[PDB]
Each structure stands twice: as C-alpha cells, then as structure tokens.
Design a protein around this ligand. Structure first.
Ligand SMILES: CC[C@@](O)(C(=O)O)c1cc2n(c(=O)c1CO)Cc1cc3c(N)cccc3nc1-2
Ligand SMILES: CCCCCCCCCCCCCC(=O)O
Ligand SMILES: CCCCCCCCCCCCCC(=O)O
Ligand SMILES: CCCCCCCCCCCCCC(=O)O
Ligand SMILES: CCCCCCCCCCCCCC(=O)O
Ligand SMILES: CCCCCCCCCCCCCC(=O)O
Length: 583
C-alpha cells in the first residue's frame, strides 16, 4: 500500500473502477466543468497512475492521493473564473487545501434537473457508445450530489448499465426499462437523503444517541456476537459514520475498508452470513456487509428478567456504567428482536433508563422496577397494531385505493400542506404498504421503519423549506425515535377553515382519458385532496359517493362518441350534485 498510494489504489481497484471513481471524484468538486474536461482529467490521472504501477519510484508517484488530486484540481486553468474563491484553496498547503476544497463543494449547484429521454433515444445512445453513456451517468449524478459516497454511485451505475443491457434488447423496451430507472432514481434520492439525515441527526442529537442506535442495529444483525464485540463494532462504526459525515471521500473509504477488513477477519466472532461478502473485491466489501441479512438468532436465549429485573445488583451494575449497562440491555433486547424497528428498541431502552433513574433512587428499587417489562408491551403493540391495521386495509383496497384512504386521512389532519406534497406523501406511503406488507409479520416493522424513514424525511425536507404547520415542524424536529409516533399522533384539524370553491380546480377535460395510468392517478388524487380541502367535514362515506359519481363520470365521458362536451356538460352537473351533497 504505502509506497505509491495511487499505484496501490489502482492495483486494488483495477483500471475500470479506478477510472470511474476518479471521474466521480472530480465531478463532485469540478461540478461546473463540461463532461469533456473531466474525461480528459481522468485520462491524464489514469495515465499517471499507470506509470506508478509500472514503477512505484517513478516521478511524483510517492505523493499522497490528496496531494495529487488537489494538485490536479489546481491545474484547471479556469478554476478562479468558474469557481471563484475555491481557486483560493490552491494557495494552501495540503492538509488545509483539501479541507478548503471540501468546504467549497456545493450541495445545491443549480444545474437543470435531469430529464429522462425517450426510451428509444436512451437505448440508441447506450448502443452508440456504452462507455460514454454510462460515464455521463456518473458525471451528471455525481456533480449534483457532491457528497454522495462515490463507491455507492458505482453500484448504482452497474445496475443502470444492467437495466439498459437487458431492456434495450427486450420486446417491450419501455415496459422493461422504465420501472428499473424509476427504482434506481427513487433508491438514489432515498440513499442521498438518508445519508444527509443521519449526518444531521448525528450533530443534533450527539454521539451517544447514534451509539445507542448502532448497538440496537448491530445486535439485530449479529445476534451471535458477544456484547464486547458489538461494542467494539459500535465504536468503529461511530468513527466511520462521523468521518464520512465530514465528507472526504478517501478518509471515509479507508474507514469503511478498515472496518470491513476487521469484520471479515473476525467472522466467527460476528456472523455466519458474511462469507460471500468477505470474498468480494475491496471496493464492494463494506457495501456488501451493510446489506447482509441478520444472522440467525442463537437458540433458546433466556429471558432478560434475570439480569435486568431480578438480579440484586441491577442498580449497582447500572450506576457504575450506565450507558454500558443500558447498552447491554439494548444488545440483549435487540438480538432477540430482529422483528422490531430500531426506534422501537430505543423506546424500550429509554423506558428502561427512565425507570432505573426513577427507581434506583428509591428506598426499595426492586419493588419499584419489578414490572418494567409490562411497560414495554403497549410500546411494542402500537407499531404491531398499526402495521396489522394498515396491511389489512391495503389488502382489501389495493394500492391505489389505499393511497386515497391515506390521502383523505392526512389532508384532514394537516389541511394546509400543499396539495402536491399531500399527494406525493400519500402515494409514497401507499407504496411502503405495498412493499412492506408482502413480508411476513416477523419482517414488517423493520421494513416499514426503513421506508417510512425515507417518506417521512422527504416530507420534513419539503416542510423545512416551506413550513405550514407547527405540528409538522414539531414531529420533524423531534428525536428520530419519536418522529413516526408524533406523526401517527396527529389529530384531525378542527380549526381549519374550508378552502373557497374554485371552478377550474374541479373542471375536467378529455385529456384525462389519454394520460398515463400514473398521470391520471395523480390528477384524480390531486382533485381528491382539493375536494377534502374544500369540504373537510365530508365523511369517508360522503366522499365515496362523490368519488363514485366522478368515477362513473370519467368512465362515461371518456367513451361514448365525439366528447369534450360531457366533461364540460356532465362536469357541470357532477360538480353541482357534489356541491349539494357535501353542502
Ligand atoms: C439518469 C437516470 C434518470 O434520468 C432517470 O430517467 O431515471 C434520473 C436519475 C436520477 N435522478 C433523476 O431525476 C433522473 C431523471 O428524473 C435523480 C437522481 C438521484 C440519484 C442519487 N441521489 C444517487 C444515485 C443515483 C441518482 N439518480 C438520479
Ligand atoms: C487520485 C484518485 C483518487 C481515486 C479515488 C479512490 C477511491 C477509493 C474508494 C473505494 C474504497 C471503498 C472501501 C469501502 O467502501 O468499503
Ligand atoms: C457503549 C455502548 C453505548 C450505548 C449507549 C447507551 C444506550 C442507552 C439507550 C437510550 C436510548 C436513547 C435513544 C436516543 O437518544 O435517541
Ligand atoms: C401508511 C403506510 C403504512 C405502512 C405500514 C404501517 C407502518 C406503521 C408504523 C410502523 C412502525 C415504524 C417504526 C416505529 O415507529 O417503530
Ligand atoms: C402532510 C401530512 C403528512 C401525513 C402524516 C404522515 C403520517 C405517517 C405516519 C405513519 C403511517 C402509519 C399508518 C397510518 O396512516 O395510520
Ligand atoms: C365540489 C366539487 C366536487 C367535484 C368532484 C371532485 C372529484 C375529486 C376526485 C375524485 C377521485 C376519485 C379517484 C378514483 O376513485 O379513481
């Protein structure tokens, strides 16, 4: 490794991966550079790397990656003209220089949004020049997400390439390709949002809160590992997470690689499921391990009662190292419950903590805390019930109707949220139902936690930028442990003044018949939100009557001879009848 670091990276990563990562890396700093300029830099950097591979002692090959990268950045002629004060980073020595470059990454570069070309256009461009087509994908995404972990982008790119490879040869290219591009896009946005969320919550709630989350998550994953091993892993994972949040690619990657290396050298102390991951290339190890399914739980683990309720030295053991004792509780509880969300486990540990804090100061602590496990039962059943109720509702409704039930519900709880956000959130909330309810009960809560975190965070981001409800701000600014229950606790808004009727809002044209399924659904759901906003006291029942009238009306107007007029004409009377029925 140490000698020529660039040659070592090139040897470990291989040429293709090396070139792709260098491209991503430059694109994340030189966010305004044309694709051609980056290609040229990458080629120059790769040709240099090859000289160091041929001879570690070759000129400049003993410089650090940071030194070489920044030197190269500082050779961009238009640096000052295009990036202004970032060019001032070049006047600094290289620990300070990289830090300076790091600070000048732009989280919002004001580039035009990415647009999806026609399927035939995409597949043709892919065919004409696969390498260019894919490298453009890397470039365009990376420079819009300068902190997105480069290797993970590589994994997105490889699936992006696989979508095109398969689907551009398919019979129905679009039917193959589009859902795959939609999934990558959604996963991409989600991953990027989750990354920022975790780093934001790290600095807001502190390292201890993160460690607790990690103990719970790591214990679920590796239930056979000893506590001391989970605790070591929590320490290392915290350093990784902290340094990766700081945002330097190489520092983050080396931390992750070091952790992945340790995990792979200690599989017998950690998990029986890591063998395949640990055989993979260095580049993919940590990513692979991050996605590993939970190990099987050890057979016939005893109750937690003995150590955490019935032992005579609960209070003594607690008081000598509270976080360690609480970590042990959380470790024991989590390893036995891969079916819980991490946040539920944290509710249990917080409950236990509050009880020990209250009870251990009592004259007779054991009498005080003896039934603490009763206190867990309603906390556990709340998400379990909510899941049962929602999955049962999804099954009876199907996804679209499920989204509409949510739409009506949430519009009534928080009517001042913009229509498109209510639509988006409700639609996405329906998708988590569609996805997570396909799991047996044992896996539903972690699924829902994962996907709810995406959907609820997206809502909070939108709400941060354009706030309308103190209640939503409260839930969004609360602990992540209480985020979801806070939202669940939202009550119908009874102070809400109905939105004035707008004619155009409830006016429909024959274009509605030719819209895609999605386009039609969003148009219908948009009106449904507006209907609730105009008539918040309308019941599910009364709404269903208007909705059934509307549904008949569109089925009618879309198919029976020369017809934009019914849409106007029946539109007049559907509206009138609805207005009276909800009047
Ligand atoms: C290049 C693929 C595509 O053009 C597509 O058609 O799906 C596309 C891809 C992506 N985005 C887009 O808005 C569009 C177009 O809306 C946002 C976005 C965020 C990403 C992220 N944070 C990480 C990784 C990949 C991402 N990809 C996309
Ligand atoms: C000067 C060119 C710099 C090229 C950037 C190389 C980036 C290497 C990161 C890949 C290591 C991944 C480790 C991991 O995530 O487990
Ligand atoms: C060395 C192991 C560190 C474990 C830290 C103690 C865990 C206590 C759980 C309390 C729950 C807090 C959750 C939170 O703050 O978001
Ligand atoms: C509206 C879509 C519902 C999706 C499935 C129901 C999920 C209910 C909340 C589950 C708990 C998430 C994690 C937690 O708070 O403990
Ligand atoms: C703009 C209003 C946002 C809607 C509030 C989000 C509520 C999500 C809570 C988790 C969903 C649980 C299932 C349910 O709806 O009962
Ligand atoms: C007060 C004017 C009411 C006009 C009719 C409003 C229709 C709202 C959208 C109906 C959504 C139904 C969606 C569906 O079931 O396919």
């Amino acid at each position: 490794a140490h000698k020529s670091e660039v040659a070592h990276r090139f040897k470990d990563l291989g040429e293709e991966n090396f070139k792709a990562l260098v491209l991503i890396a430059f694109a994340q700093y030189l966010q305004q550079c044309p694709f051609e300029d980056h290609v040229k830099l990458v080629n120059e950097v790769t040709e240099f790397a090859k000289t160091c591979v041929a001879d570690e002692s070759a000129e400049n090959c003993d410089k650090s990656l940071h030194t070489l990268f920044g030197d190269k950045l500082c050779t961009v002629a238009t640096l000052r003209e295009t990036y202004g004060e970032m060019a001032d980073c070049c006047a600094k020595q290289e620990p300070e220089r990289n830090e300076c470059f790091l600070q000048h990454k732009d989280d919002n570069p004001n580039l035009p949004r990415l647009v999806r070309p026609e399927v035939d256009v995409m597949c043709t461009a892919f065919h004409d020049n696969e390498e260019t087509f894919l490298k453009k994908y890397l470039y365009e995404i990376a420079r819009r997400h300068p902190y997105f972990y480069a290797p993970e982008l590589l994994f997105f790119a490889k699936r992006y390439k696989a979508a095109f490879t398969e689907c551009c040869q398919a019979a129905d290219k679009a039917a193959c390709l589009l859902p795959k591009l939609d999934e990558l896009r959604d996963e991409g946005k989600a991953s990027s949002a989750k990354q920022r969320l975790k780093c934001a919550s790290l600095q807001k709630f502190g390292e201890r809160a993160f460690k607790a989350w990690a103990v719970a998550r790591l214990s679920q994953r590796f239930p056979k590992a000893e506590f001391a091993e989970v605790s070591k892993l929590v320490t290392d994972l915290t350093k990784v997470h902290t340094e990766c949040c700081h945002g330097d690619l190489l520092e983050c990657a080396d931390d992750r690689a070091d952790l992945a290396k340790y995990i792979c050298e200690n599989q017998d102390s950690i998990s029986s499921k890591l063998k395949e991951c640990c055989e993979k290339p260095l580049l993919e190890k940590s990513h692979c391990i991050a996605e590993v399914e939970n190990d099987e739980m050890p057979a016939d683990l005893p109750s937690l009662a003995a150590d955490f309720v019935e032992s005579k030295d609960v209070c003594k053991n607690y008081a000598e190292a509270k976080d360690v004792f609480l970590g042990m509780f959380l470790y024991e509880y989590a390893r036995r419950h891969p079916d819980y969300s991490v946040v539920l486990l944290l509710r249990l540990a917080k409950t236990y903590e509050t009880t020990l804090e209250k009870c251990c100061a009592a004259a007779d602590p054991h009498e005080c805390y003896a039934k603490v496990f009763d206190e867990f039962k309603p906390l556990v059943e709340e998400p379990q019930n909510l899941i049962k109720q929602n999955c049962e509702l999804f099954e009876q409704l199907g996804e679209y109707k499920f989204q509409n039930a949510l739409l009506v519900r949430y519009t009534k709880k928080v009517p001042q949220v913009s229509t498109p956000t209510l639509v988006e959130v409700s639609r996405n909330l329906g998708k988590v139902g569609s996805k997570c309810c396909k799991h047996p009960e044992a896996k539903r809560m972690p699924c829902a936690e994962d996907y709810l975190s995406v959907v609820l965070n997206q809502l909070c981001v939108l709400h941060e930028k354009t706030p309308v409800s103190d209640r939503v701000t409260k839930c969004c600014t609360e602990s992540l442990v209480n985020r979801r229950p806070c939202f669940s606790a939202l009550e119908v808004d009874e102070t809400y003044v109905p939105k004035e009727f707008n004619a155009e809002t409830f006016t429909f044209h024959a274009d509605i018949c030719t819209l895609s399924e999605k386009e039609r659904q969003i148009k219908k759901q948009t009106a449904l939100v507006e209907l609730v906003k105009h008539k918040p006291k309308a019941t599910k029942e009364q709404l269903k009557a208007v909705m059934d009238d509307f549904a008949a009306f569109v089925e009618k107007c879309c198919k029976a001879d020369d017809k934009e007029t019914c849409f106007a004409e029946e539109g007049k009377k559907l509206v009138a009848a609805s207005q009276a029925a909800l009047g």
